[PDB]
Amino acid sequence: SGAIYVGNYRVVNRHLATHNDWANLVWEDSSRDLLVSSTTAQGCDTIARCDCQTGVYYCSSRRKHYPVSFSKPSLIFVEASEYYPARYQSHLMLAVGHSEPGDCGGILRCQHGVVGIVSTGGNGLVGFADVRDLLWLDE
Ligand SMILES: COc1ccccc1[C@H](NC(=O)OC(C)(C)C)C(=O)N1CCC[C@H](C(N)=O)C1
Ligand SMILES: [Zn+2]
Numbered sequence: 001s002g003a004i005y006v007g008n009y010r011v012v013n014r015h016l017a018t019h020n021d022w023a024n025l026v027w028e029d030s031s032r033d034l035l036v037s038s039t040t041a042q043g044c045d046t047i048a049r050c051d052c053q054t055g056v057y058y059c060s061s062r063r064k065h066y067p068v069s070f071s072k073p074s075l076i077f078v079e080a081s082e083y084y085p086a087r088y089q090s091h092l093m094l095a096v097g098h099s100e101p102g103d104c105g106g107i108l109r110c111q112h113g114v115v116g117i118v119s120t121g122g123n124g125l126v127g128f129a130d131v132r133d134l135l136w137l138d139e
Pocket of ligand 1: 015033078081082083084089099100101102103104118119120121122123
């Protein structure tokens with residue numbers, strides 16, 4: 001679990017969005033596993049606007065942060081789950097790092113700000129949904 005809070009927006013994994021997120025929907029994209037909802041309070045986070053390929057992510061299943069080298073956002077095949085059919089997930093970055101069911105929502109950060117959130121994983125891999133291209137989150 002986890003979310004990014006920037007301005008009057010809350011960014012979460014679309015498969016973990018609540019009834020309240022959907023009732024305050026701003027934008028969602030199933031192909032990216034992202035959903036953004038509106039908030040009444042001002043958020044605590046800031047978004048990176050960069051091309052970093054290194055950073056640090058929070059791993060809830062270890063209560064620890066780990067450094068990672070990750071691939072640029074791209075279209076990556078993701079196996080079926082209860083949440084989605086087998087499909088290509090877009091804007092996904094992969095890295096070698098621990099993740100397991102329940103780690104979605106952990107933030108990946110570089111020196112410039114928030115890069116994205118955990119969205120997939122498996123067998124010593126961790127995948128992050130990028131948010132750096134969502135320029136409108138900043139206004
Ligand atoms: C962080 O996700 C990890 C990490 C390691 C191993 C497995 C997983 C997840 N698998 C998982 O939860 O499987 C269950 C439901 C328990 C059968 C995973 O990769 N998902 C599930 C949630 C939706 C994700 C997506 N963006 O399509 C893909
Ligand atoms: Zn950066």
